[PDB]
Short mmCIF file of C-alpha atoms and ligand atoms in Angstrom, two decimals:
data_model
loop_
_atom_site.label_atom_id
_atom_site.label_comp_id
_atom_site.label_asym_id
_atom_site.label_seq_id
_atom_site.Cartn_x
_atom_site.Cartn_y
_atom_site.Cartn_z
CA UNK A 1 -163.71 34.07 -23.62
CA UNK A 2 -162.96 37.48 -22.55
CA UNK A 3 -163.52 40.58 -25.06
CA UNK A 4 -161.56 44.05 -24.71
CA UNK A 5 -163.50 46.76 -26.43
CA UNK A 6 -162.21 50.72 -26.56
CA UNK A 7 -164.87 53.07 -25.16
CA UNK A 8 -166.37 55.37 -27.43
CA UNK A 9 -163.67 58.34 -28.02
CA UNK A 10 -166.46 60.74 -25.99
CA UNK A 11 -166.80 58.35 -23.34
CA UNK A 12 -163.21 57.80 -22.91
CA UNK A 13 -162.86 61.56 -22.96
CA UNK A 14 -165.61 62.25 -20.14
CA UNK A 15 -164.19 59.33 -18.03
CA UNK A 16 -160.37 60.91 -17.59
CA UNK A 17 -162.36 64.14 -16.96
CA UNK A 18 -164.16 62.49 -13.91
CA UNK A 19 -161.12 60.77 -12.62
CA UNK A 20 -158.78 63.63 -12.68
CA UNK A 21 -161.14 66.82 -11.74
CA UNK A 22 -160.91 67.93 -8.01
CA UNK A 23 -164.40 67.63 -7.52
CA UNK A 24 -165.27 66.86 -3.51
CA UNK A 25 -169.02 66.63 -3.93
CA UNK A 26 -168.70 62.84 -4.63
CA UNK A 27 -171.59 61.39 -2.81
CA UNK A 28 -173.92 61.94 -6.23
CA UNK A 29 -172.53 58.85 -7.48
CA UNK A 30 -174.85 56.69 -5.11
CA UNK A 31 -178.10 58.80 -5.98
CA UNK A 32 -177.11 57.99 -10.08
CA UNK A 33 -176.79 54.46 -9.68
CA UNK A 34 -179.81 54.10 -7.56
CA UNK A 35 -181.71 56.00 -10.09
CA UNK A 36 -180.49 53.82 -13.22
CA UNK A 37 -181.47 50.64 -10.95
CA UNK A 38 -184.91 52.66 -10.61
CA UNK A 39 -185.32 52.82 -14.48
CA UNK A 40 -184.40 49.41 -15.05
CA UNK A 41 -187.00 48.43 -12.46
CA UNK A 42 -189.56 50.65 -13.97
CA UNK A 43 -189.07 48.91 -17.35
CA UNK A 44 -189.61 45.24 -15.89
CA UNK A 45 -192.61 46.34 -14.43
CA UNK A 46 -194.09 48.06 -17.58
CA UNK A 47 -193.37 44.99 -19.66
CA UNK A 48 -194.83 42.67 -17.16
CA UNK A 49 -198.10 44.33 -17.40
CA UNK A 50 -198.52 43.02 -20.89
CA UNK A 51 -196.35 39.60 -20.45
CA UNK A 52 -196.65 38.25 -16.75
CA UNK A 53 -194.19 35.69 -17.91
CA UNK A 54 -191.36 37.86 -17.77
CA UNK A 55 -191.34 38.11 -13.88
CA UNK A 56 -190.89 34.09 -14.19
CA UNK A 57 -187.28 35.11 -13.60
CA UNK A 58 -188.60 36.89 -10.42
CA UNK A 59 -191.40 38.77 -8.94
CA UNK A 60 -189.71 40.89 -6.30
CA UNK A 61 -188.73 44.40 -7.78
CA UNK A 62 -186.25 45.93 -5.47
CA UNK A 63 -182.90 47.55 -4.82
CA UNK A 64 -180.00 46.62 -2.14
CA UNK A 65 -176.73 48.54 -0.75
CA UNK A 66 -174.11 46.16 0.11
CA UNK A 67 -171.01 47.61 1.76
CA UNK A 68 -168.03 45.33 1.97
CA UNK A 69 -165.21 47.04 4.12
CA UNK A 70 -162.87 43.82 3.99
CA UNK A 71 -162.88 44.06 -0.11
CA UNK A 72 -163.24 47.49 -0.18
CA UNK A 73 -166.39 47.03 -2.24
CA UNK A 74 -169.93 48.94 -2.45
CA UNK A 75 -172.46 46.55 -4.15
CA UNK A 76 -175.73 47.94 -5.96
CA UNK A 77 -178.21 44.94 -6.94
CA UNK A 78 -181.36 45.33 -8.49
CA UNK A 79 -184.02 43.03 -10.00
CA UNK A 80 -184.81 45.19 -12.92
CA UNK A 81 -184.85 44.40 -16.70
CA UNK A 82 -180.97 43.77 -17.23
CA UNK A 83 -179.00 44.33 -20.06
CA UNK A 84 -178.42 42.06 -23.13
CA UNK A 85 -174.77 41.57 -24.90
CA UNK A 86 -175.74 44.20 -27.44
CA UNK A 87 -176.84 46.74 -24.70
CA UNK A 88 -173.26 46.49 -22.96
CA UNK A 89 -170.82 46.58 -26.01
CA UNK A 90 -172.89 48.88 -28.63
CA UNK A 91 -176.41 50.22 -27.91
CA UNK A 92 -176.18 51.85 -24.31
CA UNK A 93 -172.62 53.57 -25.51
CA UNK A 94 -174.43 54.79 -28.70
CA UNK A 95 -177.32 56.35 -27.30
CA UNK A 96 -174.68 57.96 -24.25
CA UNK A 97 -172.77 59.61 -27.25
CA UNK A 98 -174.77 62.54 -27.62
CA UNK A 99 -175.37 63.33 -23.89
CA UNK A 100 -171.64 62.92 -23.11
CA UNK A 101 -170.73 65.58 -25.77
CA UNK A 102 -173.57 67.93 -24.45
CA UNK A 103 -172.43 67.10 -20.83
CA UNK A 104 -168.89 68.21 -21.59
CA UNK A 105 -169.77 71.26 -23.56
CA UNK A 106 -171.93 72.21 -20.45
CA UNK A 107 -168.82 71.92 -17.84
CA UNK A 108 -166.80 74.23 -20.15
CA UNK A 109 -169.59 76.30 -20.32
CA UNK A 110 -169.70 76.49 -16.14
CA UNK A 111 -171.76 73.55 -15.38
CA UNK A 112 -171.44 71.56 -12.15
CA UNK A 113 -170.14 67.50 -12.60
CA UNK A 114 -173.52 66.76 -10.39
CA UNK A 115 -175.65 67.93 -13.50
CA UNK A 116 -174.38 64.55 -15.32
CA UNK A 117 -177.71 62.54 -14.83
CA UNK A 118 -179.37 65.49 -16.87
CA UNK A 119 -177.48 63.99 -19.86
CA UNK A 120 -177.93 60.17 -19.29
CA UNK A 121 -174.48 59.50 -18.60
CA UNK A 122 -174.79 59.67 -14.82
CA UNK A 123 -173.29 56.01 -14.30
CA UNK A 124 -169.72 57.22 -15.37
CA UNK A 125 -169.79 59.41 -12.08
CA UNK A 126 -169.00 55.63 -10.51
CA UNK A 127 -165.43 56.75 -11.83
CA UNK A 128 -165.13 59.78 -8.80
CA UNK A 129 -165.11 56.92 -6.31
CA UNK A 130 -164.01 53.49 -8.27
CA UNK A 131 -160.80 52.73 -9.84
CA UNK A 132 -162.49 49.74 -11.17
CA UNK A 133 -165.87 49.19 -11.71
CA UNK A 134 -167.35 45.29 -12.18
CA UNK A 135 -171.39 44.76 -13.61
CA UNK A 136 -173.08 41.55 -13.63
CA UNK A 137 -176.27 41.52 -15.65
CA UNK A 138 -178.89 38.94 -16.59
CA UNK A 139 -182.07 40.21 -19.29
CA UNK A 140 -184.45 37.58 -20.03
CA UNK A 141 -183.73 37.39 -23.74
CA UNK A 142 -179.75 36.83 -23.15
CA UNK A 143 -176.95 35.01 -21.04
CA UNK A 144 -175.47 36.25 -17.67
CA UNK A 145 -172.30 38.78 -18.72
CA UNK A 146 -169.81 40.53 -16.69
CA UNK A 147 -168.80 44.04 -17.84
CA UNK A 148 -165.94 45.47 -16.35
CA UNK A 149 -163.48 48.79 -16.58
CA UNK A 150 -160.93 50.51 -14.59
CA UNK A 151 -161.08 53.34 -17.16
CA UNK A 152 -157.99 53.93 -19.39
CA UNK A 153 -160.04 53.82 -22.30
CA UNK A 154 -161.17 50.08 -22.48
CA UNK A 155 -163.69 47.69 -20.79
CA UNK A 156 -164.13 44.01 -21.20
CA UNK A 157 -167.07 42.01 -21.56
CA UNK A 158 -167.75 37.96 -20.81
CA UNK A 159 -169.75 35.38 -20.06
CA UNK A 160 -170.58 35.31 -16.17
CA UNK A 161 -169.87 31.70 -14.67
CA UNK A 162 -170.43 32.90 -11.37
CA UNK A 163 -173.67 32.80 -8.86
CA UNK A 164 -176.88 33.03 -11.44
CA UNK A 165 -178.88 36.34 -10.56
CA UNK A 166 -182.27 34.89 -12.32
CA UNK A 167 -182.72 38.96 -13.75
CA UNK A 168 -181.21 42.34 -13.40
CA UNK A 169 -178.01 44.20 -12.64
CA UNK A 170 -175.29 44.40 -9.65
CA UNK A 171 -172.84 47.06 -9.90
CA UNK A 172 -169.90 46.35 -7.80
CA UNK A 173 -167.58 49.50 -6.84
CA UNK A 174 -164.13 48.70 -6.19
CA UNK A 175 -163.54 52.25 -4.22
CA UNK A 176 -160.34 54.25 -4.08
CA UNK A 177 -158.23 54.12 -0.96
CA UNK A 178 -159.51 57.56 0.26
CA UNK A 179 -163.12 56.64 -0.53
CA UNK A 180 -163.94 54.16 2.17
CA UNK A 181 -166.36 56.82 3.80
CA UNK A 182 -169.11 55.13 1.22
CA UNK A 183 -168.72 51.76 3.20
CA UNK A 184 -170.40 53.28 6.50
CA UNK A 185 -173.58 52.68 7.27
CA UNK A 186 -174.54 56.39 8.57
CA UNK A 187 -172.88 57.58 5.42
CA UNK A 188 -174.91 55.48 3.14
CA UNK A 189 -178.37 56.20 4.96
CA UNK A 190 -177.55 60.00 5.00
CA UNK A 191 -176.82 59.73 1.14
CA UNK A 192 -180.12 57.90 0.33
CA UNK A 193 -182.20 59.95 2.31
CA UNK A 194 -180.86 63.23 1.10
CA UNK A 195 -180.90 62.23 -2.83
CA UNK A 196 -183.29 59.08 -2.84
CA UNK A 197 -186.11 59.73 -0.89
CA UNK A 198 -188.64 59.22 -3.79
CA UNK A 199 -187.90 56.13 -5.39
CA UNK A 200 -190.88 53.98 -5.88
CA UNK A 201 -188.84 50.64 -4.93
CA UNK A 202 -187.53 49.35 -1.59
CA UNK A 203 -184.01 50.41 -0.96
CA UNK A 204 -182.49 47.79 1.32
CA UNK A 205 -178.85 48.72 3.25
CA UNK A 206 -176.99 45.00 4.25
CA UNK A 207 -175.38 45.90 7.57
CA UNK A 208 -171.96 44.16 7.78
CA UNK A 209 -172.00 41.35 10.58
C1 9RZ B 1 -171.67 48.18 -18.08
O1 9RZ B 1 -172.74 48.87 -16.99
C2 9RZ B 1 -172.97 50.00 -17.62
C3 9RZ B 1 -173.10 50.32 -18.94
C4 9RZ B 1 -173.35 51.85 -19.25
C5 9RZ B 1 -174.81 52.17 -18.57
N1 9RZ B 1 -174.94 51.31 -17.00
C6 9RZ B 1 -175.40 51.94 -16.46
O2 9RZ B 1 -175.90 53.18 -16.20
C7 9RZ B 1 -176.06 51.59 -14.84
N2 9RZ B 1 -175.58 51.66 -13.96
N3 9RZ B 1 -176.51 51.07 -12.69
C8 9RZ B 1 -177.26 50.51 -13.63
C9 9RZ B 1 -178.54 49.72 -13.03
C10 9RZ B 1 -179.33 48.88 -13.99
O3 9RZ B 1 -179.93 48.02 -13.41
C11 9RZ B 1 -179.21 48.93 -15.21
C12 9RZ B 1 -180.06 48.26 -16.13
O4 9RZ B 1 -180.01 46.85 -15.84
N4 9RZ B 1 -180.31 48.66 -17.26
C13 9RZ B 1 -181.42 47.93 -18.14
C14 9RZ B 1 -180.21 50.18 -17.63
C15 9RZ B 1 -179.75 50.73 -18.22
C16 9RZ B 1 -179.58 52.06 -18.76
C17 9RZ B 1 -180.27 52.85 -17.83
N5 9RZ B 1 -179.71 54.47 -18.07
C18 9RZ B 1 -180.34 55.28 -16.98
C19 9RZ B 1 -180.42 56.86 -17.41
O5 9RZ B 1 -179.29 57.08 -18.33
C20 9RZ B 1 -179.28 56.22 -19.72
C21 9RZ B 1 -179.00 54.89 -19.46
C22 9RZ B 1 -180.51 52.42 -16.78
C23 9RZ B 1 -180.94 51.44 -16.75
C24 9RZ B 1 -177.88 49.80 -15.71
C25 9RZ B 1 -177.29 50.52 -14.88
C26 9RZ B 1 -174.66 49.99 -16.83
#
């Protein structure tokens, strides 16, 4: 059912650095996650040009931002290519190894945490604001999976039994108690206008009722 994995040593080191460094420019996490969603949308868009049946699992190519004050969660949903079990457990972590090592050397050489995206490890900036991150994903070639980590050196992967998503990735940020500003409509709008004004897919902010 649920399998537990150890993060690659370098990624575990980067995650503890992100969690324990005093750094007030935390809003960068949202730019990084939207950029990752844009890359996944680019991939499915590109593949569909030679195989239009890749869009049978959904033609709409977009990003949704869903704050939820009651649950203290910020969800970023996209209809990109999605991730396989191999991506989640091995392949994305393997590729992230060099970028993680390089990023930590750069930080030691005086670089700022905001440069994280230049090293292909932008995702991990989610741990500036989140105590736990849940990622639900569905790739055309595989089953729906749920990845999760509260850091501490491990992550879990399980087959997801929840609502089918067709194709794409849903990033669920379980925010730290002092990071609730990222659930505010005006705050999300400000961040998106400042960092993500030039993304080639519609970004829809879901207003709470
Ligand atoms: C446990 O899950 C996490 C495992 C660690 C890496 N993760 C993310 O970086 C991530 N954050 N938000 C996303 C949204 C998405 O749609 C996807 C996605 O489906 N794919 C295919 C995807 C995969 C890789 C990238 N790259 C961005 C540039 O840096 C090199 C990786 C981009 C999109 C992934 C993410 C996900």
